[PDB]
Design an enzyme around this catalytic site. Structure first.
Site, PDB file in Angstrom:
ATOM      1  N   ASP A 155       0.813  -1.213   0.000  1.00 40.12           N
ATOM      2  CA  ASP A 155       0.000   0.000   0.000  1.00 40.12           C
ATOM      3  C   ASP A 155       0.856   1.276   0.000  1.00 40.12           C
ATOM      4  OD1 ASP A 155      -1.953   1.928   0.242  1.00 40.12           O
ATOM      5  OD2 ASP A 155      -2.553   1.358   2.283  1.00 40.12           O
ATOM      6  N   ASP A 202      -0.979   5.410  -5.638  1.00 41.09           N
ATOM      7  CA  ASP A 202      -1.532   4.643  -4.518  1.00 41.09           C
ATOM      8  C   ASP A 202      -1.884   3.217  -4.938  1.00 41.09           C
ATOM      9  OD1 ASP A 202      -2.756   3.700  -2.252  1.00 41.09           O
ATOM     10  OD2 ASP A 202      -4.467   5.071  -2.237  1.00 41.09           O
TER      11      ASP A 202
HETATM   12  N1  LIG Z   1      -4.241   3.655   0.187  1.00 40.17           N
HETATM   13  C1  LIG Z   1      -5.223   3.346   1.111  1.00 40.17           C
HETATM   14  N2  LIG Z   1      -4.943   2.602   2.143  1.00 40.17           N
HETATM   15  C2  LIG Z   1      -5.928   2.176   3.140  1.00 40.17           C
HETATM   16  C3  LIG Z   1      -5.534   0.728   3.401  1.00 40.17           C
HETATM   17  C4  LIG Z   1      -5.794  -0.146   2.190  1.00 40.17           C
HETATM   18  C5  LIG Z   1      -7.249  -0.147   1.828  1.00 40.17           C
HETATM   19  N3  LIG Z   1      -7.373  -0.833   0.552  1.00 40.17           N
HETATM   20  C6  LIG Z   1      -8.044  -2.020   0.411  1.00 40.17           C
HETATM   21  O1  LIG Z   1      -8.542  -2.689   1.316  1.00 40.17           O
HETATM   22  C7  LIG Z   1      -8.106  -2.499  -0.991  1.00 40.17           C
HETATM   23  C8  LIG Z   1      -9.138  -3.314  -1.390  1.00 40.17           C
HETATM   24  C9  LIG Z   1      -9.236  -3.781  -2.685  1.00 40.17           C
HETATM   25  C10 LIG Z   1      -8.273  -3.425  -3.601  1.00 40.17           C
HETATM   26  C11 LIG Z   1      -7.230  -2.609  -3.197  1.00 40.17           C
HETATM   27 CL1  LIG Z   1      -6.035  -2.189  -4.374  1.00 40.17          CL
HETATM   28  C12 LIG Z   1      -7.130  -2.141  -1.902  1.00 40.17           C
HETATM   29  C13 LIG Z   1      -7.850   1.257   1.715  1.00 40.17           C
HETATM   30  C14 LIG Z   1      -7.377   2.306   2.727  1.00 40.17           C
HETATM   31  C15 LIG Z   1      -8.075   2.169   4.062  1.00 40.17           C
HETATM   32  O2  LIG Z   1      -7.160   2.678   5.053  1.00 40.17           O
HETATM   33  C16 LIG Z   1      -5.874   2.954   4.445  1.00 40.17           C
HETATM   34  C17 LIG Z   1      -7.665   3.730   2.263  1.00 40.17           C
HETATM   35  S1  LIG Z   1      -6.753   4.145   0.764  1.00 40.17           S
END
Ligand SMILES: NC1=N[C@]23CC[C@H](NC(=O)c4cccc(Cl)c4)C[C@]2(COC3)CS1
Length: 390
Positions: free
Chosen positions: A37, A233
């Site tokens: 992430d 991201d």
């Molecule tokens: N950048 C991010 N980070 C966070 C952590 C990861 C989360 N993403 C997912 O569960 C997810 C699901 C499916 C596909 C993909 Cl690619 C990602 C969303 C957030 C929530 O908190 C931080 C927000 S946005």
């Protein structure tokens, strides 16, 4: 030559569910799959039973567990997770051959965070301390890795979309890409790398200076494209665009594709569209070019993405051999987000050492016989700093 064989092909997953890497935590090591992430800054792992977790971090079984006696609470629009902070020994098996002591948020409570069938049990937030929770004193993982080892202050991501749906078994068996920790593997890209500055070290923030749909300038004041920021991201599925930019882009994409009419639910990213097997009319959809600020004064370059990136393959709502997709561009109120579907087109170099993000065409991007994704430059572009929002 590809000089990081140990790390090539170490990711699994897909844009809809996230791309993850294997990690271990604790002594003896506990294996967990962890979402990569670049849009957050905490290393956070399931640490208690949950219906959607096959496993979790058991702190009482790690001899090297240290309790920081401090909670952390992360609410987002979709839901939230809450946890307890500590440190432990952390490794990446298909990574550098090093073990580091890192901060871990042991997730004890969550709402709509874990996803049924994602196959990941935690998140590796790879962005900077400024956006770490509860505050910037909680050193992120990559900062610990760099401080404690000789790993260079750089990582690179190749996210590989299949171009078609993968079932539960197939996604587990398929290579989903590579995270190269500490370097750039030349096997993962074609053509040249082009670099855009990291505007500020919090998110991986960049500046978009021009947008084209099939070569046609969207013609907005470039500040609109970065309102209130633009980030890269890997933890967001879609290309997300500021409201007004989304409205302009969708109008232009509709116009370019107007030989076929799609329902409003499609453009809202909710509803799938399907075509008879093999007949997806890629050629009616436009290419999208995002011009990014270059490293040289008054210079920009562009990345060009195909509908094979911005239409996300999904399996049909009912039994069919149709090829179906969702529109993976959506509206944002927190700025532009270059999510996984854009990242699938490119090898992306997070050159923290040099405060810059590199893009090259990915060796695993999906395309057709007539068009490919592209990274091209230079272009003479004036007053690009004016494109940044304050
Ligand atoms: N950048 C991010 N980070 C966070 C952590 C990861 C989360 N993403 C997912 O569960 C997810 C699901 C499916 C596909 C993909 Cl690619 C990602 C969303 C957030 C929530 O908190 C931080 C927000 S946005």
């Amino acid at each position: 030559r590809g000089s990081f064989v140990e790390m090539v092909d170490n990711l699994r997953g897909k844009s809809g569910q996230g791309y993850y890497v294997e990690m271990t935590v604790g002594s003896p090591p506990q294996t967990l799959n962890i979402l990569v992430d670049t849009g957050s800054s905490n290393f956070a792992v399931g640490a208690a039973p949950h219906p959607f977790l096959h496993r979790y971090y058991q702190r009482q079984l790690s001899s090297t567990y240290r309790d920081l006696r401090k909670g952390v609470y992360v609410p987002y629009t979709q839901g939230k997770w809450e946890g307890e902070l500590g440190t432990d020994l952390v490794s990446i098996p298909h990574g550098p051959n090093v073990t580091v002591r890192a901060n871990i948020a042991a997730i004890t409570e969550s709402d709509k965070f874990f996803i049924n069938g994602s196959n990941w049990e935690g998140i590796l937030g790879l962005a900077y301390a400024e956006i770490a929770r509860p505050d910037d004193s909680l050193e992120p993982f990559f900062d610990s890795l760099v401080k404690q080892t000789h790993v260079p202050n750089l990582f690179s991501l190749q996210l590989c979309g299949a171009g078609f749906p993968l079932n539960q078994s197939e996604v587990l068996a398929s290579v989903g890409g590579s995270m190269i920790i500490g370097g750039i593997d030349h096997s993962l890209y074609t053509g040249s790398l082009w670099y855009t500055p990291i505007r500020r070290e919090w998110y991986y923030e960049v500046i978009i200076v021009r947008v084209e749909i099939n070569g046609q300038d969207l013609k907005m004041d470039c500040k609109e494209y970065n309102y209130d920021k633009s980030i890269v991201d890997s933890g967001t599925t879609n290309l997300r665009l500021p409201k007004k930019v989304f409205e302009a882009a969708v109008k232009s994409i509709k116009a370019a594709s107007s030989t076929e009419k799609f329902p409003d639910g499609f453009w809202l990213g909710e509803q799938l569209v399907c075509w008879q097997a093999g007949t997806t009319p890629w050629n009616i959809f436009p290419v999208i070019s995002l011009y990014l600020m270059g490293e040289v004064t008054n210079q920009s370059f562009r990345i060009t993405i195909l509908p094979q990136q911005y239409l996300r393959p999904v399996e049909d709502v009912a039994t069919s051999q149709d090829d179906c997709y969702k529109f993976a561009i959506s509206q944002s109120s927190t700025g532009t987000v270059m999510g996984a579907v854009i990242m699938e087109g490119f090898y992306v170099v997070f050159d923290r050492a040099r405060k810059r993000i590199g893009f090259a065409v990915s060796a695993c991007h999906v395309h057709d016989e007539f068009r490919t994704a592209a990274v091209e430059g230079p272009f003479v572009t004036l007053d690009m700093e004016d494109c940044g929002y304050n």
